[PDB]
Antibody, heavy 227, light 209 residues
């Protein structure tokens, strides 16, 4: 069956270089139009570049002068050389075949064959323990007798981080959000618990943050930070 | 041009739903994307389908507006849908902002929005993060806009895609990273959430409590 399988992604520092390869099977790269499409985590699709059958290349403005698409018919593979990488470039890069318009030798905007994609992460970061800050309950996080409080787990690398409340004795009403990848290359997430507002004075709430990659455990008591 | 899509569309299984692609010669291809997967070509031109794509999916176009219709929704149709087209601009192609189609399996829920100001401890670390938490809503699609006073803010904003809570409703989070100087140089900051055409807005100020 027709397949495309991208490779070459991983961690790379800003300004560094990285080359992705797009190897095809059961169909030829030579007589097809080939595109690259990337998608930042939690964002939409963005077209990157395209190469024609006879060799013409076009690039998006966000990538012009820094990326270069290549075609190797001997290996039946497609390439994407990436230089001067920025934090805007971290994304899953997809390799796709562009169907040709019938009447002309012009590629349509219909991409029918796709690869599975390869993740590129542009970051200078290595193992970095998180910083935990309290999300204290106040008049604005309380409504209908229930109170919302949480912990902000900030600037850690790499994934994952596990959060519990009161050493696992408090599970109901807890939600730990997925991490977000910031432009600095570090991760951040939040975890919240919804508690009765009358318990804020007596009950103690402690979030337990674990980052095994850095061998760090942080306990943070969250209380109404009155002024 | 740029292609505009509604953020959300929904239907119960067996119902029909149509999503629109508006662009600011002119015709549109459609793609389907399930979580963790590559996009899949559903329909190109006005109504031609690749092999394997069910007859449930059909498309039309009326002047500036292209449409994709699904005729008996199956839960497997729940995914993000992107349109693509040629562009008047420099770039060869533009993709739409994306529409999440939800196959309804529970009643709609209005979101709860909790906005946390920067903690004094983080300010002591020379940082300031605004945390906007959106919870208990369905379908799992929201839009988050940030304001400094009355001026919209785009830089320093990061938002997670909605995921299920323990009670099977959706939650999402949004962050606005500021300098401590930026935080204290404005009268207030606001997080504005749009869900199913309705808007909830919360506001924090540096002088709290």
């Amino acid at each position: 069956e027709v397949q495309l399988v991208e490779s070459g992604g991983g961690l790379i520092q800003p300004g560094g270089s990285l080359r992705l390869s797009c190897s095809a099977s059961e169909f030829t790269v030579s007589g097809n139009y080939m595109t690259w499409v990337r998608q930042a985590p939690g964002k939409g699709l963005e077209w990157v570049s395209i190469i024609y059958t006879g060799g013409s290349t076009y690039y998006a403005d966000s990538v012009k002068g820094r990326f270069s698409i290549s075609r190797d018919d001997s290996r039946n593979t497609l390439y994407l050389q990436m230089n001067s990488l920025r934090a805007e470039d971290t994304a899953v890069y997809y390799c796709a075949r562009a169907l040709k318009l019938q009447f002309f030798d012009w590629p349509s905007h219909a991409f029918d064959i796709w690869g599975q994609g390869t993740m590129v992460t542009v970051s200078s970061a290595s193992t970095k323990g998180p910083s935990v800050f309290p999300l204290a309950p106040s008049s604005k996080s309380t409504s209908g007798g229930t109170a919302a409080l949480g912990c902000l787990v900030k600037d850690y690398f790499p994934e994952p981080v596990t959060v519990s409340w009161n050493s696992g004795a408090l599970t109901s009403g807890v939600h730990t959000f997925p991490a977000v990848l910031q432009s600095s290359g570090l991760y951040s997430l939040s975890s919240v618990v919804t508690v009765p507002s009358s318990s804020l004075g007596t009950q103690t709430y402690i979030c337990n943050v674990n980052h095994k990659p850095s061998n760090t455990k942080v306990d943070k008591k969250v209380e109404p930070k009155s002024c | 041009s740029a292609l505009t899509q509604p953020p959300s569309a929904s239907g119960s299984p067996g119902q029909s739903v149509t999503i629109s692609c508006t662009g600011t010669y002119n015709y549109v291809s459609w793609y389907q994307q399930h979580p963790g997967k590559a996009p899949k070509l559903i329909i190109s031109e006005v109504n031609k389908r690749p092999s394997g794509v069910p007859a449930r999916f059909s498309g039309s176009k009326s002047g500036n507006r292209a449409s994709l219709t699904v005729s008996g929704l199956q839960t497997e149709d729940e995914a993000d849908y992107y349109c693509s087209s040629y562009t008047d601009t420099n770039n060869f192609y533009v993709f739409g902002t994306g529409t999440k189609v939800t196959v309804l399996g529970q009643p709609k829920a209005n979101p709860t929005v909790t906005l946390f100001p920067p903690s004094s401890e983080e300010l002591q670390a020379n940082k300031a993060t605004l945390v906007c938490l959106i919870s208990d809503f369905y379908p799992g699609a929201v839009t988050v806009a940030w304001k400094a006073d009355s001026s919209p803010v785009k830089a320093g904003v990061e938002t997670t895609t909605p995921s299920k809570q323990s009670n099977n409703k959706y939650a999402a989070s949004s962050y606005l990273s500021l300098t401590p100087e930026q935080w204290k140089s404005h009268r207030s900051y606001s997080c504005q959430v749009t869900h199913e055409g309705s808007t909830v807005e919360k506001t924090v100020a540096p002088t709290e409590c």
